[PDB]
Write an enzyme that holds these catalytic residues in place. Structure first.
Site, short mmCIF file in Angstrom:
data_model
loop_
_atom_site.label_atom_id
_atom_site.label_comp_id
_atom_site.label_asym_id
_atom_site.label_seq_id
_atom_site.Cartn_x
_atom_site.Cartn_y
_atom_site.Cartn_z
N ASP B 25 44.44 -0.70 71.15
CA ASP B 25 44.78 0.35 70.21
C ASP B 25 45.34 -0.21 68.92
OD1 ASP B 25 45.60 2.54 68.97
OD2 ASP B 25 46.79 3.32 70.65
N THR B 26 44.48 -0.32 67.91
CA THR B 26 44.90 -0.90 66.65
C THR B 26 45.88 0.01 65.92
OG1 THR B 26 42.94 0.03 65.53
CG2 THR B 26 42.75 -2.19 66.40
N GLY B 27 46.00 1.29 66.32
CA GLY B 27 46.99 2.21 65.79
C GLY B 27 48.34 2.13 66.46
C1 LIG Z 1 48.46 7.29 71.87
C2 LIG Z 1 46.94 7.16 71.72
C3 LIG Z 1 46.29 7.28 73.09
C4 LIG Z 1 46.36 8.24 70.82
N1 LIG Z 1 46.80 8.24 69.41
C5 LIG Z 1 46.32 7.14 68.56
C6 LIG Z 1 47.36 6.05 68.45
O1 LIG Z 1 46.78 4.84 67.87
C7 LIG Z 1 48.63 6.41 67.66
C8 LIG Z 1 48.41 6.49 66.14
C9 LIG Z 1 49.72 6.88 65.49
C10 LIG Z 1 50.52 5.91 64.88
C11 LIG Z 1 51.74 6.28 64.38
F1 LIG Z 1 52.52 5.34 63.77
C12 LIG Z 1 52.25 7.55 64.48
C13 LIG Z 1 51.42 8.49 65.02
F2 LIG Z 1 51.86 9.77 65.11
C14 LIG Z 1 50.20 8.19 65.57
N2 LIG Z 1 49.68 5.41 67.89
C15 LIG Z 1 50.88 5.76 68.37
O2 LIG Z 1 51.21 6.85 68.80
O3 LIG Z 1 51.70 4.69 68.27
C16 LIG Z 1 53.11 4.93 68.55
C17 LIG Z 1 53.59 4.07 69.73
C18 LIG Z 1 53.06 2.65 69.78
O4 LIG Z 1 53.93 1.72 69.11
C19 LIG Z 1 54.44 2.16 67.87
O5 LIG Z 1 53.36 2.25 66.95
C20 LIG Z 1 53.31 3.54 66.35
C21 LIG Z 1 53.98 4.47 67.35
C22 LIG Z 1 55.08 3.56 67.94
C23 LIG Z 1 55.09 4.03 69.40
S1 LIG Z 1 47.08 9.68 68.72
O6 LIG Z 1 47.50 9.40 67.38
O7 LIG Z 1 47.97 10.39 69.59
C24 LIG Z 1 45.55 10.56 68.67
C25 LIG Z 1 44.67 10.32 67.62
C26 LIG Z 1 43.42 10.91 67.62
C27 LIG Z 1 43.04 11.72 68.69
N3 LIG Z 1 41.83 12.39 68.80
C28 LIG Z 1 41.80 13.08 69.91
N4 LIG Z 1 40.71 13.80 70.25
C29 LIG Z 1 40.74 15.20 70.64
C30 LIG Z 1 41.21 15.57 71.99
C31 LIG Z 1 39.75 15.60 71.67
S2 LIG Z 1 43.23 12.96 70.95
C32 LIG Z 1 43.95 11.97 69.73
C33 LIG Z 1 45.18 11.33 69.75
#
Ligand SMILES: CC(C)CN(C[C@@H](O)[C@H](Cc1cc(F)cc(F)c1)NC(=O)O[C@H]1[C@H]2CO[C@H]3OC[C@@H]1[C@H]3C2)S(=O)(=O)c1ccc2nc(NC3CC3)sc2c1
Ligand SMILES: [Y+2]
Ligand SMILES: [Y+2]
Ligand SMILES: [Y+2]
Ligand SMILES: [Y+2]
Ligand SMILES: [Y+2]
Lengths: 99, 99
Positions: B25-27
């Site tokens: 997960d690059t995000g």
């Molecule tokens: C958790 C993943 C499984 C999903 N996600 C992507 C992640 O990459 C997020 C990106 C993000 C970064 C942030 F900075 C802040 C954010 F709000 C979001 N990362 C994250 O939460 O990171 C966290 C944790 C990791 O460590 C640190 O880094 C940053 C923080 C912190 C704690 S998503 O965003 O929930 C998502 C995106 C598109 C999508 N499309 C969908 N399709 C539909 C149903 C059909 S469902 C769905 C869900």
């Protein structure tokens, strides 16, 4: 481009005519922006993450300019903390991960 | 390996002796697992995503076997819907994004 992951992988995009930065997020199925306005009809979707769910509007056939490409895709609009480019957009530009 | 993004990018890992699948997960800045138990001292964190926050325990110097590498890194443990390998682990294996 090729990038390493020492920095958060933000890219600059133009989405529906608006300039935004968004994270190239291999963990996101869908592409999501906050604070853009898109024209025409949309559908409700509730969508889920780590902290709970986000309520969004789903727009189809939205122009996105990204990484030298112009693609048309689905965009979700709602109050995400960070804009994300998901796999639905990244597959359209042939993105790969090496590891 | 090199992978496209047509599929969710799950990989199989061994973390603290336990076998799990996790999304590359690059995000994600940090690496997070649900339902693992790790020994020793930890520190509380609260962390944010789409839709809200997740309460986790932060463990340092945890063994992660991933993609033929063994790395030691920080692992967060808490009730995430999906386990994620973040940039804090992916940088240790030299991972890149090509777009
Ligand atoms: C958790 C993943 C499984 C999903 N996600 C992507 C992640 O990459 C997020 C990106 C993000 C970064 C942030 F900075 C802040 C954010 F709000 C979001 N990362 C994250 O939460 O990171 C966290 C944790 C990791 O460590 C640190 O880094 C940053 C923080 C912190 C704690 S998503 O965003 O929930 C998502 C995106 C598109 C999508 N499309 C969908 N399709 C539909 C149903 C059909 S469902 C769905 C869900
Ligand atoms: Y439909
Ligand atoms: Y649709
Ligand atoms: Y759809
Ligand atoms: Y720590
Ligand atoms: Y848990």
């Amino acid at each position: 481009p090729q990038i390493t992951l020492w920095k958060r992988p933000f890219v600059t995009v133009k989405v529906g005519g608006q300039l935004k930065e968004a994270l190239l997020d291999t963990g996101a199925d869908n592409t999501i922006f906050e604070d853009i306005n898109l024209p025409g009809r949309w559908k409700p979707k509730m969508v889920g993450g780590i902290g709970g769910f986000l309520k969004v509007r789903e727009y189809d056939q939205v122009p996105i300019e990204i990484a030298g490409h112009k693609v048309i895709g689905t965009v979700l609009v709602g109050p995400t903390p960070v804009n994300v480019i998901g796999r639905d957009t990244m597959t359209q530009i042939g993105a790969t991960l090496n590891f």
